[PDB]
């Protein structure tokens, strides 16, 4: 009214639009701060950083939204993280490799990265909201980003009758993390396990679209530097992603494959036998070489823990902490490429 | 104590004697093998590839075995024809020709007998029931201890124990 | 003088000497694989042009071609190389559309709005009409390998030799073709791998 | 903080140590020459060494609030070494708040009723902090009169050789040498 | 400059080849055992630094790995390592009140103390290649 | 056989690789009537313009709040706020207070206990009595 004039002038058709207009990005103090908070290059205008915050659930047009920008950025993130794991840990099993990727470039970490940037969400999308807010509608899950996986003809039976799905095929059919493909309104309600997945998905597409924007404006090297600064900089203990089943058989199969002497468990130390909390220190040898060692309060557990640590040492072999990546050869003026170590594959045992 | 500064001095533990013999007139690199368990990232030389140049004599060189706990021996006492005898017998009378009876008869492990043949579905359900009936005889104190033993095993294989 | 790991199976990983599982049709237990290095190099040269046989190491040529269904994986397989090869072909296929000098009619906004209309964003708008999955089709990539003779040198055990389609020959062919690219990248680099995906995969897929 | 991030399981575990009250101790004895004169550790000098183990003060992770102590199995406590005339002239007292009920006993008379194990428990008990961990720590002291005890399987080992055995130091060194063959 | 000893030039590559490394840096003479990625909360407000400033630390008494340990007599030579930190900001403690009082005197004098602390983030800790020196 | 656990994710280390200022917004409220805001009004005209030009990563919102003291409310990436009443303060006292909100994080104040805070494991491991030269009593 007369006493409460509007703070930000807006035409009457503003609320009708799904997302704020591009020119509105030039009057938002949240955008300008976000653009500088990330030290983005001035080549990326504010109208482009604003487009990275509009999810396809808020604006269904192919433009004005995150769809295409996020797809390009996802391909860059997944690529730079994939080649980086195979050069730092070339012996990781395929299952552990899928979890390592999902632990860096998955919806969970990207949600934490988007929040690390100070990006607040809009309650409900519309042309009246601040362009500096992440816009999306968690009530509409009918939006999905394009990927490179295919739908399995037995997906219906995979979920109902618990049919078996192998690992070798997840590289061709499933998505980049091993997940199968294709797995008025009233706001008087509470959250849902679906709205959380829709919100977590929106934050992920934003972080991806930012990488795609840098690639479109700055170039390839700038995108790799951004991924290498905010994603690869995170910390992850891959040893905690391992879950073994009969590790004593897998270690016996490993020694047999590499032609090592059969593994023999030996008691290196012990104390408290016939007590409530003993300590048996068992070490597994292949001849005279000590492969792994584990200390537990039982003889069997100490033998299993020793075999698990022996298998982790094999899988967690690392040529270096900061190894060269094949992507470095695209940057002109680089030294000749030295062949990397290619492992045979994880051991398959009874 | 009265203040945190005094409490820190009463709980003080000196550094390791290796760090006390400091050098003079220049820098120095000493061999300080700690009394601790090593991480899985210290890959043993046997697990390094033949190309990896980091393979090198022990640091000690750059400056009998313990008792046996588990050394099994694999045996193959069953022939392709005896495997069929194990299958017809197990299906003829799973009560009499148990896996223990067939194991001792053919001099095998109880597991191998189960790898060659399985009892009919009817004989298997009564086995799961027999183990479920004895479980309902447990009190709250014994049922909780049994569940803890099943969780510690799972936690162990997850790296949590 | 050691032995090549692809030629033999570890002696101490073998079993009693007979099969312990039942088979419905003994005809499905018969399947021949390639064991001639000459026949393998003939495929690499035909697939990667002259000089491709020497591109990869001796042990890597057989690894990138072996599937996890061969000899219970006792000899290495190409599941990790395929994971990287897909990330590379997925990236080069995307770059192929962005830099494609083709412009189509834009979309009309129901609300009458006008897009930002930036040039950098025009390259990304090309994904509206052309998606990478339209080019990286299983049947297309799987058909390339059959034409270049990949079915004669690949090592794998089909579920049922009488029906290769139901056994997964398509998924197996794609995994093997991706691995050949994932191996070139780790051994030669992205420069060489990129040059091959554009001339030996994309140029043949259209 | 890096030095404390890891597995503290084995630092807080209870180790079972062993010592004989009859074996000469070149470190705890006052006589250090000739070799044939080196005595075992005297009653109090042995008790001061034990109280350190029961408290856990030999550990680099020691804290007085945490009960990070170890066990100590003592054997041959009948031959507890004493100097002067302590055995027959030292007296232990006792009172129960009732006037006239003062109980006295000499060391030799106490070793006749409860053996040398009780003489060593009293000596270690007075050397421990007077708090709510004194009874737990003192309970981990396992004193026996002869060579027999129920903990011959609990004593700490290194390659099957109990600490204090003839060749336990060679078994330890052999295990560390094989532990340096890794990055 | 003073040349590095041959004993250090021979084993430093073996020190840098191991997986993990720690260092004991000295800020105004006080030691701090840190690693790459650790956060340091100094017990004083460093003047003339704002969040985002990068510091080069050059006084390390110990740079070691699991098995090997490089020791400098006063300190380690700056040419052997590169340690860098970034100022993360300034933190504060809650106000604490110290009441100074004697028996049989009613005057209770109060002392209010609220100190500020500068926070650093160790973002680089590497050992250099000395095959050139 | 190795099964992968899919409940562990990577953690961020602000400062390693990239830095991000924790203060993302500064609310600056004044009053054209209250006498306790005479200094705040001078800070908005003399020192706030240059201070805001030097901190482009912070969002500054100047809004009147009559009938109330002047406050500086900072918003942080962790989701918390810190408001400082600057009543009866001179412009340069406001600036010193604004630099406090910029340099600060949203974390609650804590007493000084330990300088170093680490999440990576010990380089030399943790002590164990079963991995040394043994100890004879």
UniProtKB/Swiss-Prot annotation, chain B:
CC per GO annotation: mitochondrial large ribosomal subunit
Leader sequence residues: none
Name of the protein this chain belongs to: Large ribosomal subunit protein mL58
Family under the similarity heading: Belongs to the mitochondrion-specific ribosomal protein mL58 family.
UniProt subunit comment: Component of the mitochondrial large ribosomal subunit (mt-LSU). Mature N.crassa 74S mitochondrial ribosomes consist of a small (37S) and a large (54S) subunit. The 37S small subunit contains a 16S ribosomal RNA (16S mt-rRNA) and 32 different proteins. The 54S large subunit contains a 23S rRNA (23S mt-rRNA) and 42 different proteins.
Any GO molecular function: structural constituent of ribosome
Gene name of this polypeptide: mrpl20
Portion of the parent chain present: 41 to 225 of 225
Species classification: Eukaryota, Fungi, Dikarya, Ascomycota, Pezizomycotina
Keywords: Mitochondrion, Ribonucleoprotein, Ribosomal protein
Organism: Neurospora crassa (strain ATCC 24698 / 74-OR23-1A / CBS 708.71 / DSM 1257 / FGSC 987)
Free-text function comment from the UniProt entry: Component of the mitochondrial ribosome (mitoribosome), a dedicated translation machinery responsible for the synthesis of mitochondrial genome-encoded proteins, including at least some of the essential transmembrane subunits of the mitochondrial respiratory chain. The mitoribosomes are attached to the mitochondrial inner membrane and translation products are cotranslationally integrated into the membrane.
Cell compartment(s), UniProt: Mitochondrion
From Swiss-Prot, chain D:
Similarity field: Belongs to the universal ribosomal protein uL13 family.
NCBIfam families referenced in this protein's UniProt entry, alphabetically: rplM_bact
Summary of subunit composition and partner proteins: Component of the mitochondrial large ribosomal subunit (mt-LSU). Mature N.crassa 74S mitochondrial ribosomes consist of a small (37S) and a large (54S) subunit. The 37S small subunit contains a 16S ribosomal RNA (16S mt-rRNA) and 32 different proteins. The 54S large subunit contains a 23S rRNA (23S mt-rRNA) and 42 different proteins.
Database matches in PANTHER family: LARGE RIBOSOMAL SUBUNIT PROTEIN UL13M, RIBOSOMAL PROTEIN L13
GO MF terms, alphabetically ordered: mRNA binding; structural constituent of ribosome
Predominant localisation class: mitochondrion
CDD domains, A to Z: Ribosomal_L13
One Pfam family per UniProt: Ribosomal_L13
Stated role: Component of the mitochondrial ribosome (mitoribosome), a dedicated translation machinery responsible for the synthesis of mitochondrial genome-encoded proteins, including at least some of the essential transmembrane subunits of the mitochondrial respiratory chain. The mitoribosomes are attached to the mitochondrial inner membrane and translation products are cotranslationally integrated into the membrane.
Cell compartments where the protein resides: Mitochondrion
Full protein name: Large ribosomal subunit protein uL13m
GO cellular component: mitochondrial large ribosomal subunit; ribosome
UniProt keyword terms in alphabetical order: Mitochondrion, Ribonucleoprotein, Ribosomal protein
UniProtKB/Swiss-Prot annotation, chain E:
UniProt-recorded name of the protein: Large ribosomal subunit protein bL21m
Function text: Component of the mitochondrial ribosome (mitoribosome), a dedicated translation machinery responsible for the synthesis of mitochondrial genome-encoded proteins, including at least some of the essential transmembrane subunits of the mitochondrial respiratory chain. The mitoribosomes are attached to the mitochondrial inner membrane and translation products are cotranslationally integrated into the membrane.
GO MF terms held by the record: structural constituent of ribosome
Cell location: Mitochondrion
Family to which the UniProt record says this protein belongs: Belongs to the bacterial ribosomal protein bL21 family.
GO cellular component: mitochondrial large ribosomal subunit
Assembly, per entry: Component of the mitochondrial large ribosomal subunit (mt-LSU). Mature N.crassa 74S mitochondrial ribosomes consist of a small (37S) and a large (54S) subunit. The 37S small subunit contains a 16S ribosomal RNA (16S mt-rRNA) and 32 different proteins. The 54S large subunit contains a 23S rRNA (23S mt-rRNA) and 42 different proteins.
Keyword terms of this UniProt record: Mitochondrion
Full protein stretch here: 85 to 217 of 217
Primary location group: mitochondrion
UniProtKB/Swiss-Prot annotation, chain F:
Cellular component aspect of the GO annotation: mitochondrial large ribosomal subunit
Presence of keyword Cell cycle: no
Residues annotated as transmembrane: none
Family label: Belongs to the mitochondrion-specific ribosomal protein mL43 family.
Name used for this protein in its record: Large ribosomal subunit protein mL43
Domain of life: Eukaryota
Subunit note: Component of the mitochondrial large ribosomal subunit (mt-LSU). Mature N.crassa 74S mitochondrial ribosomes consist of a small (37S) and a large (54S) subunit. The 37S small subunit contains a 16S ribosomal RNA (16S mt-rRNA) and 32 different proteins. The 54S large subunit contains a 23S rRNA (23S mt-rRNA) and 42 different proteins.
Localization in the cell: Mitochondrion
Gene3D superfamilies: Glutaredoxin
GO BP terms: mitochondrial translation
Statement: the UniProt record of this protein carries the keyword Transmembrane helix: no
Annotated GO MF terms: structural constituent of ribosome
Primary role: Component of the mitochondrial ribosome (mitoribosome), a dedicated translation machinery responsible for the synthesis of mitochondrial genome-encoded proteins, including at least some of the essential transmembrane subunits of the mitochondrial respiratory chain. The mitoribosomes are attached to the mitochondrial inner membrane and translation products are cotranslationally integrated into the membrane.
Species name: Neurospora crassa (strain ATCC 24698 / 74-OR23-1A / CBS 708.71 / DSM 1257 / FGSC 987)
UniProt entry keywords in alphabetical sequence: Mitochondrion, Ribonucleoprotein, Ribosomal protein
